[PDB]
Amino acid sequence: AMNALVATNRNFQRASRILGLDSKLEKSLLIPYREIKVECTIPKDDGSLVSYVGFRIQHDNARGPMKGGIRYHPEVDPDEVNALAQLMTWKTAVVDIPYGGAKGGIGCNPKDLSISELERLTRVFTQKIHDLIGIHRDVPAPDMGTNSQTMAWILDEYSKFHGHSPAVVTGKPIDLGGSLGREAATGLGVVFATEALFAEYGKSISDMTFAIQGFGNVGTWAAKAIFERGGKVVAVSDINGAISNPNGIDIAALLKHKAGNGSLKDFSGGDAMNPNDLLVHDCDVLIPCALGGVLNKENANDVKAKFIIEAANHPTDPDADEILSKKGVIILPDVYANAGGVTVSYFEWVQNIQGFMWDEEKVNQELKRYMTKAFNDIKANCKTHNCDLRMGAFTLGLNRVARATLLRGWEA
Amino acid sequence: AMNALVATNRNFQRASRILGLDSKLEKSLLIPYREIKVECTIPKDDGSLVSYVGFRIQHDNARGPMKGGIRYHPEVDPDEVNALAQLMTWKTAVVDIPYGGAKGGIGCNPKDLSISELERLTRVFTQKIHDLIGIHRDVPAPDMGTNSQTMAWILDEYSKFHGHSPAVVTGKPIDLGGSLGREAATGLGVVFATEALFAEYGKSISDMTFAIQGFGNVGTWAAKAIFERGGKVVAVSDINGAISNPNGIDIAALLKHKAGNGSLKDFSGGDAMNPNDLLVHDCDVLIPCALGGVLNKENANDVKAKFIIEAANHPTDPDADEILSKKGVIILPDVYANAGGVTVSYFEWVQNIQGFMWDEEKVNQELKRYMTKAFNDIKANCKTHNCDLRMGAFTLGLNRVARATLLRGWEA
Amino acid sequence: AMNALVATNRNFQRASRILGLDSKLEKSLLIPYREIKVECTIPKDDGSLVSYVGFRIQHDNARGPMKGGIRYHPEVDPDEVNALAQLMTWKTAVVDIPYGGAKGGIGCNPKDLSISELERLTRVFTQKIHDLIGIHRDVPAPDMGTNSQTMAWILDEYSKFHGHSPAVVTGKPIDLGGSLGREAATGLGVVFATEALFAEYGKSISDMTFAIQGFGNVGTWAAKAIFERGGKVVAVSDINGAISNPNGIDIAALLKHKAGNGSLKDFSGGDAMNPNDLLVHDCDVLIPCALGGVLNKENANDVKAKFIIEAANHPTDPDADEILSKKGVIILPDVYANAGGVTVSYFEWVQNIQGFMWDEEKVNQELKRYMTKAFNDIKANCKTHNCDLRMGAFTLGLNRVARATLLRGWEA
Amino acid sequence: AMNALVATNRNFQRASRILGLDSKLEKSLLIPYREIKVECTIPKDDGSLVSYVGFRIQHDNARGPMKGGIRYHPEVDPDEVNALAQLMTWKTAVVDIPYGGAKGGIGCNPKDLSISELERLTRVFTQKIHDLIGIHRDVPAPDMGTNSQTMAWILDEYSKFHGHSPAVVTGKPIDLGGSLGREAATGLGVVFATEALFAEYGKSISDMTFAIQGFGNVGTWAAKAIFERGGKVVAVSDINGAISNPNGIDIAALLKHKAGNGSLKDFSGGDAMNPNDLLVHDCDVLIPCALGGVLNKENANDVKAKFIIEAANHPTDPDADEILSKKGVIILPDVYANAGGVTVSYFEWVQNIQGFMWDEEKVNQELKRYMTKAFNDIKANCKTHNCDLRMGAFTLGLNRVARATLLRGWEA
Ligand SMILES: NC(=O)c1ccc[n+]([C@@H]2O[C@H](COP(=O)([O-])OP(=O)(O)OC[C@H]3O[C@@H](n4cnc5c(N)ncnc54)[C@H](O)[C@@H]3O)[C@@H](O)[C@H]2O)c1
Ligand SMILES: NC(=O)c1ccc[n+]([C@@H]2O[C@H](COP(=O)([O-])OP(=O)(O)OC[C@H]3O[C@@H](n4cnc5c(N)ncnc54)[C@H](O)[C@@H]3O)[C@@H](O)[C@H]2O)c1
Ligand SMILES: NC(=O)c1ccc[n+]([C@@H]2O[C@H](COP(=O)([O-])OP(=O)(O)OC[C@H]3O[C@@H](n4cnc5c(N)ncnc54)[C@H](O)[C@@H]3O)[C@@H](O)[C@H]2O)c1
Ligand SMILES: NC(=O)c1ccc[n+]([C@@H]2O[C@H](COP(=O)([O-])OP(=O)(O)OC[C@H]3O[C@@H](n4cnc5c(N)ncnc54)[C@H](O)[C@@H]3O)[C@@H](O)[C@H]2O)c1
Ligand SMILES: N[C@](O)(CCC(=O)O)C(=O)O
Ligand SMILES: N[C@](O)(CCC(=O)O)C(=O)O
Ligand SMILES: N[C@](O)(CCC(=O)O)C(=O)O
Ligand SMILES: N[C@](O)(CCC(=O)O)C(=O)O
Ligand SMILES: [Ca+2]
Ligand SMILES: [Ca+2]
Ligand SMILES: [Ca+2]
Ligand SMILES: [Ca+2]
Ligand code: NA
Incomplete structure (x- = not known):
């Protein structure tokens, strides 16, 4: 495969040139707000240690709290999480919900971990990022390899640090x-x-x-x-x-x-x-x-x-x-x-x-x-720019993020 | 009379047996999350001191922020407040509102206190528990011997520590x-x-x-x-x-x-x-x-x-x-x-x-x-378990609390 | 054996009468600032649950942050921890260190728990009281059944909630x-x-x-x-x-x-x-x-x-x-x-x-x-009050606490 | 020539082998506690934007607050900051000061920037990392391309968020x-x-x-x-x-x-x-x-x-x-x-x-x-392990960090 972030950046560049974005604004919009890599080490059920690196890429929050899931998959790596986080920024803007983009992940294989080990890993990851996420800051969710039970553990561990916070994570079980x-x-x-x-x-x-x-x-x-x-x-x-x-x-x-x-x-x-x-x-x-x-x-x-x-x-x-x-x-x-x-x-x-x-x-x-x-809206953009569906959506979201970014300004 | 907590625990035990709860789950559900007893000392109107003991028993928060009133009555004691707090956990679950259970109180007789003395006592109690309660943590309300004017004082004193927090207490006056x-x-x-x-x-x-x-x-x-x-x-x-x-x-x-x-x-x-x-x-x-x-x-x-x-x-x-x-x-x-x-x-x-x-x-x-x-729902539960109305309600709420507890899990 | 709190309170009353304390001051000084009881449930090494009640009694903070150890022993109960916490208030005042008194404990037998179980129990207890202790609030230490390794776990878990806080607990290992x-x-x-x-x-x-x-x-x-x-x-x-x-x-x-x-x-x-x-x-x-x-x-x-x-x-x-x-x-x-x-x-x-x-x-x-x-100072006090060594020390501490209490005052 | 992190990791693996460290401890000690990359965008004096990426790598805090400088240099990149942060962990331990290791930087060339632009860049970087650093958490300092005036600006901007915090950064001007x-x-x-x-x-x-x-x-x-x-x-x-x-x-x-x-x-x-x-x-x-x-x-x-x-x-x-x-x-x-x-x-x-x-x-x-x-201490270690000076120092520091890590433990 092509590198995920090379691929996504090519699409970003193509959408930027269609909009005629200012090249300095383009560079800012490319760079993530904050990239986080944390050690996640747990005891296995037999007491022996295993260590992973957990990622939370916070790409953009111009339009609101950041949003995007957590992937547990052995090929999770920084380029993949960065590409997915950037895509969340455009996607939230395409459907016009008041969120920016983020993504997280851990390079593990859930099939290889017991359910108690998966819970410990999820809780330790949450301990390591609790101060960097939040209801109006960055709200995770499921992705490949995670589900509503994973989200329950995130809610539960986060709430030890900040009080009951149902809105800190989505895809929760109905009963939570x-x-x-x-x-x-x-x-x-x-x-x-x-x-x-x-x-x-x-x-x-x-x-x-x-x-x-x-x-x-x-x-x-x-x-x-x-x-x-x-x-x-x-x-x-x-x-x-x-x-x-x-x-x-x-x-x-x-x-x-x-x-x-x-x-x-x-x-x-x-x-x-x-x-x-x-x-x-x-x-x-x-x-x-x-x-x-x-x-x-x-x-x-x-x-x-x-x-x-x-x-x-x-x-x-x-x-x-x-x-x-x-x-x-x-x-x-x-x-x-x-x-x-x-x-x-x-x-x-x-x-x-x-x-x-x-x-x-x-x-x-x-x-x-x-x-x-x-x-x-995508249809209208395709007509305006005489572009394909991908660019119709990409330019729609990119322009909405650019507009919010420019409104917020740049002075310290 | 029977000890209130002996009585309420006998009902809990009976409902647990109808549900066939695991004994280790049962033991956890009985134990309160947190019991708080605080000194509450005020000057009386004549300047002389009186010291009371205030309680806030936080029994269970699996289903949400804890909820329950504050009783001012001479027979308030730990057993009574613990029993009341446990009943709030089941009651909130019976009517399926997103709250856990708590209860508070002071062993005093309000008729013996002036209205300025009641206000001071209420504000001091709030000073002593403000760090333990909150909109998404534990939300008081009236009970015996307290009313909407009591709640106004709680709101007002709490808001000095945390800003305007109307949702910190219910039973408030309309104008607040x-x-x-x-x-x-x-x-x-x-x-x-x-x-x-x-x-x-x-x-x-x-x-x-x-x-x-x-x-x-x-x-x-x-x-x-x-x-x-x-x-x-x-x-x-x-x-x-x-x-x-x-x-x-x-x-x-x-x-x-x-x-x-x-x-x-x-x-x-x-x-x-x-x-x-x-x-x-x-x-x-x-x-x-x-x-x-x-x-x-x-x-x-x-x-x-x-x-x-x-x-x-x-x-x-x-x-x-x-x-x-x-x-x-x-x-x-x-x-x-x-x-x-x-x-x-x-x-x-x-x-x-x-x-x-x-x-x-x-x-x-x-x-x-x-x-x-x-x-x-109580009627259907009575039919399912062939039990009386008390157990139909108690098991309905206990089962919902058990379900939330098990989803949240047990690792640290 | 006599009830520990009955015994300790008899001593307090005797010392109060030697000093001639005002009865309202005396009643305030007896009542603890705050008594906390928390559920402490952990998975055992085989995954099964065990539930304990953890105690932190914060008896008095007139003279400074509260101080006292944590006991892991099967006879730990509220009366014992209350007596111990009260004794810490007088003891800190006898040696004239700028602390008040507190004590904690769990009714468990450490010999019946593995070292990983003791660590989880210690960490959960810390999670349940982290918001109630602190460098300038209440600083634990060892007592029966705990040691410097226990304190290392308290430090480590507390620091996840509040940042690195070496002074939150004493009796630490030299290397921490x-x-x-x-x-x-x-x-x-x-x-x-x-x-x-x-x-x-x-x-x-x-x-x-x-x-x-x-x-x-x-x-x-x-x-x-x-x-x-x-x-x-x-x-x-x-x-x-x-x-x-x-x-x-x-x-x-x-x-x-x-x-x-x-x-x-x-x-x-x-x-x-x-x-x-x-x-x-x-x-x-x-x-x-x-x-x-x-x-x-x-x-x-x-x-x-x-x-x-x-x-x-x-x-x-x-x-x-x-x-x-x-x-x-x-x-x-x-x-x-x-x-x-x-x-x-x-x-x-x-x-x-x-x-x-x-x-x-x-x-x-x-x-x-x-x-x-x-x-x-004890000798001098024994001469002033013509009393025995216990009362010389007990009144010395009690008088110092009373002084600080009276200076702080009673208005809200 | 050689990749800086490849080089430093080879030295770590060699020192680990001398000490006979267990592979799971070795892996944990290699992985940084937390890696942070943040956008740092400022207006130039003429109003046009420039965008940089800033880094604060927090490698290890077992032995205390993390410590290490901030480099402004055009070759700053993640591998360099990671290597430097890791070296700070070992260095602090070699001299036996109560600190762990971190490092930060910005890939800029200070000769490109006016003094007002350098101030804005330093202040924006501080705004982006202030929640990561602190007197007892992580304390920066100069390195290549920064100086005591840079540190004055970090102090000043940090103090807007947390009050006057002289110990948040070292290398400060004598007058501050x-x-x-x-x-x-x-x-x-x-x-x-x-x-x-x-x-x-x-x-x-x-x-x-x-x-x-x-x-x-x-x-x-x-x-x-x-x-x-x-x-x-x-x-x-x-x-x-x-x-x-x-x-x-x-x-x-x-x-x-x-x-x-x-x-x-x-x-x-x-x-x-x-x-x-x-x-x-x-x-x-x-x-x-x-x-x-x-x-x-x-x-x-x-x-x-x-x-x-x-x-x-x-x-x-x-x-x-x-x-x-x-x-x-x-x-x-x-x-x-x-x-x-x-x-x-x-x-x-x-x-x-x-x-x-x-x-x-x-x-x-x-x-x-x-x-x-x-x-x-290094000479004694060289004699014990029959190793060169680098390994005498590397193992001395690594062993001290391992010891603190093992005392702290691994449960959640
Ligand atoms: N879950 C969401 O809310 C959500 C939202 C939008 C997009 N997505 C995306 O949808 C995709 C799937 O996510 P999911 O939530 O269904 O994950 P999941 O973990 O629930 O399921 C993944 C599925 O893909 C299969 N799969 C894995 N590797 C495969 C391979 N090499 N060949 C064929 N099948 C393979 C698995 O066997 C499983 O059927 C991902 O790209 C995810 O990012 C998910
Ligand atoms: N107020 C609420 O929203 C609420 C909610 C649910 C249940 N409850 C329960 O309802 C009961 C009454 O509470 P309330 O809010 O009406 O209290 P309240 O203080 O407003 O009134 C208490 C009433 O009980 C009377 N009373 C007290 N001791 C009595 C005795 N020995 N014999 C006879 N009457 C006696 C008082 O004279 C008064 O009429 C309590 O058990 C309380 O916990 C209250
Ligand atoms: N550790 C401190 O810094 C400290 C400070 C002041 C006072 N104290 C007090 O000193 C006493 C001992 O504390 P510690 O730290 O040495 O505890 P520890 O757990 O280190 O040792 C307790 C000792 O008491 C013995 N013991 C237990 N039950 C016994 C019994 N029934 N008969 C005889 N021996 C028995 C144990 O076998 C063990 O030798 C306690 O009252 C404690 O509160 C401790
Ligand atoms: N400043 C400290 O407290 C400190 C502490 C320990 C180690 N160090 C290390 O010392 C080194 C120098 O740091 P500093 O504080 O002196 O930096 P500085 O910015 O004050 O000076 C750097 C010097 O190196 C020169 N230089 C840069 N690139 C060069 C090249 N290719 N060839 C030759 N000279 C070159 C510059 O012209 C300048 O003389 C760095 O590796 C730094 O990490 C610094
Ligand atoms: N899987 C997702 O991250 C869902 C994110 C969310 O629900 O917040 C996605 O790829 O969109
Ligand atoms: N009096 C109550 O505690 C009401 C609590 C509330 O309204 O929150 C009760 O006993 O239900
Ligand atoms: N064991 C002690 O509590 C010591 C307390 C401390 O060191 O702070 C005691 O009983 O004095
Ligand atoms: N320049 C340094 O980072 C020193 C940092 C400090 O003084 O804390 C170094 O490389 O040691
Ligand atoms: Ca950006
Ligand atoms: Ca419970
Ligand atoms: Ca008192
Ligand atoms: Ca590490
Ligand atoms: Na096990």
């Missing part, structure tokens, strides 16, 4: 102040975004076949919402294998099978498939829901889809963007399509601060309102 | 950020709770006679709400005496007489009664609205009511529960029936942190909604 | 800011106190035989300091056994045996004896160095010593005091004789605050100066 | 709480260290010729102190040129020349010299006083000196260590030889806490005592 709809939000939002795009062509999800890479929090709920809107999901992969069915996979049955600890390749309602063949599978629509950088100069020519919906963060690098453009492929960008998560996190934060929770229908209605407005 | 409906909330909620129970029997308040022990914040508004629904209030007592009328007392006239500094025994619309005969008075419904432990093994066999509505905290001890069960008496438990006060306190707190107030119709509609949902 | 001389300070000060007393009779430590109950931090260093000054230590006990030698035990050899995990009853340089006979052993001087209340009305009549030096806190109850007085026994009281520990803790705190350390010769020279001045 | 002797301290300590080393051969500074690379705060005061001890300084260089005199340079005259804005090349008391030939000059003693890594695999074979005194931080990489060892060259390591600056910074910090300032002789005599004891 979480929001109805947040578990499903990213996948649902991907489908709202996809519906909005397809309507421009006079088409619907039910007209299309879909291939999905990754089957975790994003991939499961995306697949479910696609299936319920009549889409034909013809292939699904995850880290362990994959399953295909040209007639469409019964996603309801597939999810039930997964919840029983079944593996994709063993699902009886399709054919086991090599997961290394997922991205080049025949389909109308490809939805990467796992790692970034997976569409690159080596495989972009072999993509068969006419639409790519970026549910994962930065699945497509700029070399692939160019190849896929010349192939006639249309790419709905991450900073729009996957923003349902952070948008419903904003609603969770609002409910916590207000001391009163919303029903799930109100959460999703507001989510759809935000995704609809953002798409209309 | 209090909620419409809060003064009447506990007594009105008692009547909503009672109507909900009686509907299960195809009966209304207007079918019944009522005897009420105590005639302060809870007893007055309960009596008023009963009277306005056609209930016959045939006996009322307070510390100083009692009055009866088997035809029903004109509660509007009784309240006017009280407001004029009249004594119950002197009311011309009834007959003076020995207050010691109140609990055993001939009535359909007995509502204790004063001290706890007043129904016990020595008088329970003499109760004539078929319903007991626990407006007071813990008026019936476990020995009396058994005796009254064998008499066919139905007891609507404190942790449900009197939760209207803490419920509207939640609404007050919400109005304060949100910086915007509600009208009284909204307050009371939501109070009714919360009291109805809780009763319906 | 501890003071030279602090490990030996209580036993050495016992010897300085004893030498001051014996000079009044024209006697030396080398003239006397000694029996010592307890052989931990206080007993080992006391025995060593006596041995090195030619005193004959004829009996030593601990919780598992006892050893005697009428010619004097070779304490250097006894300590080496202890350091090799030997038991007292097995030491080859004496005869085994029943530890239940230690306090009635023939000797000139009896030094209790373990639990309180061990000299009581059931054994005081059989004591054979002419001098009792109270190294332990409150080893002699007031019934035993009277019996022993009538036997001609002279008792050098705890609040003077064992104050070397807290005095060198003061020096440790000063060194930490000043940022540089003293050598051991300077520590011990200053310790001797403090113990000499205190004894001279 | 600085210490006499601090300006000259690093160079004077270099000479104390050198005198101690040469005494092991029965030789003195006055027996040797010297070449000095760098002529700033370290190089000028090192040159002056060597000159005043009869040393023959035959060559001196800085960034702009160099000067040699085989008969010895009149350093007093050279320092007046420099104070007159003269360049080394113009000095009439010498012959101008290519500065690229400084390190290979014909001398007995080479003293690097500028950048790190200047002695490497490319030029170590060409060094003619028989002694290298490391005044600069990490002037010699491990490839050159091996080459020079083979040529019989003795290298006195940075973590010992240049520790006079941080030692007198410790004295400055103590004076600020004490509230009174020492005379210069007291400072320098105490500095000499610290440098003499450290050298004796």
